[PDB]
Every structure is written in C-alpha cells, then in structure tokens.
Design a protein around this ligand. Structure first.
Ligand SMILES: CC(C)CN(C[C@@H](O)[C@H](Cc1ccccc1)NC(=O)O[C@H]1CO[C@H]2OCC[C@H]21)S(=O)(=O)c1ccc2c(c1)C(=O)O[B-]2(O)O
Ligand SMILES: [Cl-]
Ligand SMILES: [Cl-]
Ligand SMILES: [Cl-]
Lengths: 98, 99
C-alpha cells in the first residue's frame, strides 16, 4: 500500500495470537504494550522524549504487520503506543518516498 | 528519493541559515528540534513521548529546508534526544510510506 501521513500511520498487527500499532521510521526497534510472549527474554532500557522505560526483550518473534509476516526482536513494556520500528519495517519492504 | 530503513533515515535540514542533522520520523506527530534561537513569539505545548509528557516551545510558520525540500511550518524546541521531522512537515514535502 501507499500510506499518507495526514494522520498517524496505524495498522493492525497480529502478535502472540490483534493490536493496533504505529509504523514508525523514527524507532530502531519494535515496542509493544504489556503482553505475554513465549520463550526467553532479557531486560533492556529504552529512552526518548520524556526519558527511559524498562522493557523485556524477546528475540525471534513472528508478527503479521498489515498482512505481511516478519520475524525479529520485540520489546515489551509500558509504552504509550504500540510501535513497529525499523527492525521489522525493513522485513516487509517498507520505504519512505518523496 | 526512496529511502530504505536498514539505517536510520537521517537527512540534513537547514533552519535559521544553519545545517543540522534530523531523523525522518513517521511516528512523530510534530517536528521537535534541539535548543536553538528562532524568531517571533512562541506558545506552550505538551507532548507525550516514550518516557512521559514534557513541555516544549512552539514556533509557527518557520522556514525550514528538509533534504533540499522547502517547507514552512511549526517547529517545537525542547529536550529531544535527536532532531525529529514529524508528520506536520513530512506531509509538506510529500512523503508517504510504501510497502
Ligand atoms: C524520539 C525518537 C528518536 C525515538 N522514538 C520513536 C518516535 O517515533 C516516538 C514514537 C512514540 C509515539 C507516540 C508516543 C510515544 C512514542 N515518537 C515521538 O516521540 O514523537 C513526539 C514527537 O511528536 C509527538 O507525537 C508522538 C509523540 C510526540 S522512541 O519511541 O522514543 C524509541 C523507540 C524505540 C527505541 C528507542 C526509543 C530506544 O532508545 O531504543 B529503541 O528500542 O530502539
Ligand atoms: Cl530484529
Ligand atoms: Cl530492501
Ligand atoms: Cl505545520
């Protein structure tokens, strides 16, 4: 698809068996609100406007992003918005065009 | 151009005659720049980021060039970790996401 930027670029994702998430070229990584995921994890600190939060880093997680499957690392914690970052945007072939 | 996302989508911007590096950020509603001098009056704005809500200075109708594309619009000044070009200016330059 081609997504304009008049509004937040929100899409439906499927992760761990549905959520709304922001397609975010400004995020290196994907950050999802509190949920359970299978497998091992390790703690991580991530930061930006307003400071840092603690998240759990799960590796090799499959996500369906607007119908496109991708696998990669997902961070879980108290983010105010679910964010799809570059680590998964690349896998669905997303580009910014102007 | 067509910008892939294997690296951070950093560009050069020009604002107040000076070149700066900034990140093209589809996850930002607003353009936020590190502390600098801009002309005119400003208004208060609260924005909510990953770590919580903060106060910034809102300057309207600011001339800014982004990767060579001329824009004129709202620029927020405050403690941001990197300069971010948000959707208010990405729309001015005609940017879309494509997959
Ligand atoms: C700041 C930027 C360089 C980085 N971020 C993405 C940015 O797109 C956020 C995404 C976001 C959107 C809504 C709410 C919270 C966060 N947008 C934002 O702050 O936008 C502001 C400006 O406009 C306003 O509208 C929206 C909020 C206001 S991040 O989330 O802080 C972030 C994401 C991933 C990682 C890290 C930090 C890190 O350290 O490691 B990491 O794992 O790679
Ligand atoms: Cl990854
Ligand atoms: Cl590619
Ligand atoms: Cl604007």
């Amino acid at each position: 698809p081609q997504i304009t930027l008049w509004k937040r670029p929100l899409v439906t994702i499927k992760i761990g068996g549905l959520k709304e998430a922001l397609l975010d070229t400004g995020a290196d990584n994907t950050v999802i609100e509190e949920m359970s995921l299978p497998g091992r994890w390790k703690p991580k600190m991530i930061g930006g406007i307003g400071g840092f939060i603690k998240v759990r880093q799960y590796d090799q997680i499959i996500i369906e992003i607007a119908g496109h499957k991708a696998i990669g690392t997902v961070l879980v914690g108290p983010t105010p918005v679910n964010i799809i970052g570059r680590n998964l945007l690349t896998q669905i072939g997303a580009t910014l065009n102007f």
